[PDB]
């Protein structure tokens, strides 16, 4: 069938690009509603206002309630209609960004996306994940296009807690493995077609970038400063991983992430931290070579991601919980079925326990 | 400076995808002006009308005058307002697509483009070239965004003259060398910033695809059939080179192309045919290793592109003509200035004569 | 523009060459003033006198006051005019040698240079660095030629404190990295032109020599004896590094050295010890691969050079001091601007902190 | 023994650098004798006079007799004292440069040389060959130093006959093999000591430059234009081979050259043309591996150098002539004695016949 690749229309990254926001956004619309993470507005709200004002734009700022829920979106629709804005800007982490995309779609207007962390591969995709106000999965909202514009201030990312950069590394490290599995199996992507070569190349670049640059990038995030390694890892966590997962494919790592959220123990760990264990689980399923397993385990360990179930607070009733994870992972319409030859609940259960054992031996040997 | 990559929002490629234009375009608008010339509407019109009709869309077919000019745009816009079209589809070669992009810009509506050939890398880009009704360059029209949707029917492309596929290879083969040069010089790209890693990776993938698949694809093109090699070369010629040139950078090869168009002798050659000589010229300028120049000359020769001035019909008064080419290639604003260290007219002159001598020696040996 | 390489007219190294000084110097002049480091004159003054006397030359010996200042040079001019000498010999470390060059230039006579340590790349260059008597930077004196003759007694070098050989390793280890950056950026060299191939080759040889021979050479310097590894490292620290920096180029490592001298904490560390940290800082800026960073950090550590700010006594108020270092490093006319794409004060600050972190982890891991 | 490298003080190369002779030479002297023959002053004189005039210098043009002989030197010195010149500029080919170096020596003043061809490696060296007014070898004049300044206008060199560039390649291609042999035998170099690492690295760079760039440069030479390949070959032919031979060492190839000049048949060939056969002779003597001899024969053949005795017009009485060559090459004082293990007349005789047979087989295969 057809080969399809999707992208945001334009992706921009640079130090202090928050000062140029207005100038980049001006071609899209004159009037703007900003949906902003509260923490971020706390240090940056004047800077944002000045950026728009200097470009001759009209802007109103709405603080974000914190969850991408139907209620929050509806609240923001009300504010948007009153403002009669021609476009939405999301500025924050993934929850803020998914909310802005959904809002913009319901208002039928352009959306710009300004990640203030590089924590997940949400920013670039044509998808918003909707939750209940209690923080539970509600539904996927499939958008007819990717954001018009994605603008990443690398200095703001560098000032955020380093754990959130690690989390994004854990999210993005899965990308190549999942897109390759889908290539091998011939699976349809979220873009609705088979893999392009472009998408697999970006997915592989993502993996190699993290291997070469991940540890260097963490030194910079820990000191809250911008270096070339950090710029490269931000691009990987954001553009490469975004295009790679959506237009290259999802498989076991994401299915296992979803499984793990059915366990209360891990629910407050970051998306990428759960994806990280999902990647190790996937390498058991696809029987990756010893040196590949070790390379991934070593990078994950070096940036502080979990490589064991105990690092996700899964310490008691492990067999029973892994049954739950395995069943959820193989539910109808999960992406585990994109693996070459598929995966049964028993195969995933087996992979979970064995990945945990590999993690546990890796750690012991590290003293 | 910021690092920027731009892309069409969605790129789709597949055999007989023209049957699916409706389902794919539906999410963007209900009412469409379809702009195509007589020849294309000749084979395509009834298929388009049925695909749109079955998706529940409205179409207004507007035969195209053949030239991308302000008058032609105004006329078509005339027709589009009357019909109350929400979106433009261009279907055909580069002049038709250029026109649909410009029209859609002036009317503030989305654009889809459906190339029926793969002969240049211009289609996916955020640029429209405006011409006189007589066919002379008027001005470049910079667009605020790349086409919303690009849809390539590989079966229609396979039916086009094989010469046009080779010409496309000639245009796309420059991509890597020009992006690499701009990366070495730190030049600004047409997307408005410095190179992303993503853009450089797609430019290099373009090059490697053409090396690996070029000759195989030309066998398919000459038999007018679709193979995976042809599919890959079409992607390289269209998506990879489009992103590579616009977000990776242009340099000497394109500037030499422009110089060659000041020479009446070379008027009957396609864009990519002149660019193919420009690439060899560039490799002399940057003093590429013998093995690289030989690889490029061999691929160019194997798919029928020119590697000498005589194969562009430049046979008489060659010194005098190359002074003209060199002076034009080095005109203020030209992309030759993106080469590391720049290039003077004298340097470009020298490279033109030596690239020609190199091509001549290469042809002599080949027999 | 023009490609230029500069050299001393003749470079000589050998064990006990101090005995052949007179014979080597005789073609330049009959009457000589020797400007001599006091420590050196303390053990070698009779040997020097005998060398000249045996060759039939006339010599007068002036002990060097210790700083290359305008006053010291003026004092020595007075002595030289009275002596009516036809040439100057400098014998000592870098401060003695720069003084002799400056003196010889002001008297308009030939200069010979006899390093008694291999501590910096001063000896061979067409430059004298002038200081205040208080030991502060005054001005660069650009000489119209390099020394006529450079004569290195490898046994005298071997008898000096081993720390001063390490210091020279730290000075010379920067050479390849800086000349390569300048090659990449197209920067002008101190010789006034673009890089020759000759200069880059000598710069690269310098780096590879230190990697292969640095540790072996330190064993010999510690035992105060001459081996082939020591002879090779002396040549690297003196001729290779001299030609390499002047005719290949300076970039971030030297700019960072200059920054660090604005900090009182490090002021009494040797030139090369500060350059060593500057090299690690540069490898952050140019995003060197992990294995290159590690190779350089390991060699620097093995010969006793600093790889952390604490090893230069920068232990308190580090952020504030690194702002100072970064601003000085990027001052107008510094060589940091020779890096590909340049470097802002923020980029250099970032590189300083991250290089320090890499150093600190390297040391921790070394237990 | 001491390790010594000698070099010209400053080497400058660039297109149209003749326009900058004044600014570059100013630092050495105010008043100049410019020595050039009719032909060179023919194209160069007005340019030189304007460059000097604009720098504020005085010039006295002294047309050169064509032969480097004691009479010619005395005459010119005559003119130089009258004019009260502080420095000599030689401009032209090797006989003019030789003369300027010798003159400047006898008058005790600095010398600048501006080669208008790149056909031998003699220009940069500290040696002048003196001849009879009739053109016969009189004596070698050893100079205490290399030229103060060497200035090569690559655009003038590109205008010279292509044959002279190839001849230069022939002269420079020996450099690495002769320096390597002297390094293996421990022979003393013309600079008066054992090999430095620097000199061996420049000799090997010369070889690799010619391999990589030789054929490319010959295309530029034949079109009479400047490319980077030509620039690199000019540097190899002039600076790298000059330092390589004088500070690296001469061996069999030069001795064979000398032997070949005792044979009237080879009189119409350039120095580098005879040396090219001498190199192949040397590779037989040292029993170089088949792949090395083939590489050298192929490069020599590709740029038009002789690889057989017939291509030096030695066609009759070849055994008898090769006895003469072998005896002369092995004369007391000749450099063949620097080969590891030495060489007897019989060994050299054998190598000459076998090198010829090798060349003949190589030409037969090539068609
Ligand atoms: N749509 C997709 O394709 C896709 C893909 C992956 C993940 N997601 C979604 O992404 C969400 C997770 O995003 P997230 O982990 O970024 O959560 P988030 O948006 O809640 O951000 C995490 C935390 O980071 C803080 N933060 C943000 N910027 C900061 C800054 N500059 N300095 C300091 N703190 C800062 C926020 O205040 C917040 O507390 C989930 O809802 C998940 O479903 C969507
Ligand atoms: N200087 C220039 O103007 C220049 C230079 C180089 C390339 N080009 C490009 O080349 C084009 C020139 O050709 P054109 O304008 O006449 O375009 P065109 O559309 O007429 O090109 C040939 C056509 O034949 C069609 N075709 C033939 N048999 C077919 C079959 N069996 N099934 C399906 N399709 C079939 C192809 O699909 C294609 O549309 C330009 O539009 C431009 O894109 C232009
Ligand atoms: N001109 C240039 O291109 C260039 C390049 C680099 C550095 N420099 C200059 O070099 C200077 C630093 O030179 P340095 O570090 O050699 O300083 P230095 O000349 O003061 O020598 C350092 C110490 O070594 C001692 N010493 C010298 N020879 C000895 C021996 N044989 N045995 C024992 N002790 C011996 C001296 O007495 C002195 O105390 C600075 O002024 C710097 O600006 C110039
Ligand atoms: N046995 C020998 O004497 C021997 C052997 C081998 C090589 N050589 C070398 O070759 C030389 C022989 O040639 P020559 O002495 O007649 O030297 P020459 O200077 O006349 O050589 C040719 C000249 O043509 C000039 N030229 C021609 N067209 C030009 C243009 N358009 N622009 C600029 N310059 C242009 C070149 O610059 C060059 O100076 C010797 O001087 C020596 O260096 C000598
Ligand atoms: Zn994810
Ligand atoms: Zn093009
Ligand atoms: Zn230094
Ligand atoms: Zn020679």
Author numbering:
A (entry chain A), B (entry chain B), C (entry chain A), D (entry chain B): 1 to 367
Question: How does the study describe this entry?
Answer:
GDH catalyzes the oxidation of glycerol to dihydroxyacetone (DHA) with concomitant reduction of NAD+ to NADH.
By contrast, Mol-B had only NAD+ bound without glycerol, and the binding was at an alternative site along the central cleft. It appears that one of the intermediate states in NAD+ access or release was captured. Our size-exclusion chromatography experiment, conducted using a HiLoad 16/600 Superdex 200 prep grade column with 50 mM HEPES-NaOH buffer (pH 7.5), also revealed a protein peak corresponding to GDH at a size consistent with its octamer. Accordingly, each protomer of the GDH octamer could independently bind ligands, as was observed in the GDHNAD∙Gly structure.
